[PDB]
Amino acid sequence: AVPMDTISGPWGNNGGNFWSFRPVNKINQIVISYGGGGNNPIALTFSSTKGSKDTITVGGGGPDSITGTEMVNIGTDEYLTGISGTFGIYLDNNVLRSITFTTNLKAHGPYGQKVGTPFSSANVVGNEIVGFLGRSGYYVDAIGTYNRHK
Amino acid sequence: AVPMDTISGPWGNNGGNFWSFRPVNKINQIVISYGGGGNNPIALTFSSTKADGSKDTITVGGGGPDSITGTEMVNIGTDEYLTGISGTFGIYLDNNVLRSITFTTNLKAHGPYGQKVGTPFSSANVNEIVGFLGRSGYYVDAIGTYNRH
């Protein structure tokens, strides 16, 4: 059997469609997209840009306009180590309401407001988040991580 | 637990590092990169172009100094979707890596990309392939599929 990186989570709900993104090189940018004219996350973009690029956007599958974004730019000596956030109701659906991206250097976020039910990965010694997986549709229904010893 | 799409394989070996790509919309293009001035696959690029014109994309393999000496492209049509893969693993430049691959859809087999050398593998064709995962480095060390009815 061919080994694969360890999955944590996903956290969230069973709605939407499965997605997965574990690029060979480091994820160095994340874009959080909001809708509704407020701090309501509806999509996430993860990219690994070496100008050649691997990239995925999940969520944002519906008609509602993206009304704002925030960006995490991960430095050369910086790498993802944890995520946390909340799930709760947005437009009658239980979806990601806030997320934080923690690295070896700092927590980035929170992106979205502290409402709903919390989740957190285990920030563990020597571990790196090397990708993400989850579920999404119009919004982000679930998210988890791929993990590898640094 | 939060469900995930079912994995078949991966087929191949434990070299390189893990990769995964399951975009929300359909994979409609594959680019096979060749090295060595011949029919030797060194990288695979999967992409999904959406109605809004953005493209999700990953390139796996091709991590080394190898010049890309050729490419082939699979363009999947509107009513076409991936259903199976098959191919072989064997030696390229003293590495045991993907040597050939075929991408089968509901309409036809595309390929083979690479020569029939080494050890064969095949997925079970039934179901839609909605993503790929595997291992890679300089080359493609392993590949498998995500599946959904």
Swiss-Prot record, chain A:
Statement on biotechnological application from the UniProt entry: Can be used for the isolation of glycoproteins from humans, plants and fungi. Is a powerful T-cell mitogen in the mouse, and can thus be used as an alternative to concanavalin A for the mitogenic proliferation of murine lymphocytes. Identified as one of the several suitable fluorescently labeled lectins that can be used in a combination for the visualization and quantification of extracellular glycoconjugates in dental supragingival biofilms grown for 48 hours in situ in the absence of dietary carbohydrates. Used in lectin-based microarrays to detect altered glycosylation in cancer tissue.
Residue ranges that the Swiss-Prot or TrEMBL entry lists as coiled coil: none
Processing and modification events after translation: Not glycosylated.
Keywords of the record: Acetylation, Cytoplasm, Lectin
Tissues in which the UniProt entry reports expression: Rhizome (at protein level). Detected in the cortex and the pith of rhizome. Not detected in vascular tissues, pericycle, endodermis or rhizodermis.
Documented activity regulation: Hemagglutinating activity is most inhibited by methyl alpha-mannopyranoside. This activity is inhibited to a less extent (about a third of the inhibition of that of methyl alpha-mannopyranoside) by methyl alpha-glucoside, other alpha-glucosides, such as maltose, isomaltose, panose or palatinose, and alpha-glucosides modified at the second position, such as methyl 2-deoxy-alpha-arabinoglucopyranoside or methyl 2-acetamido-2-deoxy alpha-glucopyranoside.
Region named N-glycan binding: 16-17, 92-93, 137-141
Domain of life: Eukaryota
Modification type N-acetylalanine: residues: 1
Classification via SUPFAM superfamilies: Mannose-binding lectins
Any single Pfam family the record assigns to this protein: Jacalin
GO terms for MF: carbohydrate binding; cell adhesion molecule binding; D-glucose binding; D-mannose binding; identical protein binding; protein homodimerization activity
Signal peptide (UniProt feature, chain positions): none
Gene Ontology cellular component annotations, sorted alphabetically: cytoplasm
Residues annotated as domain Jacalin-type lectin: 5-149
This protein's record includes keyword Acetylation: yes
A single BP term in Gene Ontology: heterophilic cell-cell adhesion via plasma membrane cell adhesion molecules
Oligomer status and interactors: Homodimer.
Protein name: Jacalin-related lectin Calsepa
Taxonomic lineage: Eukaryota, Viridiplantae, Streptophyta, Embryophyta, Tracheophyta
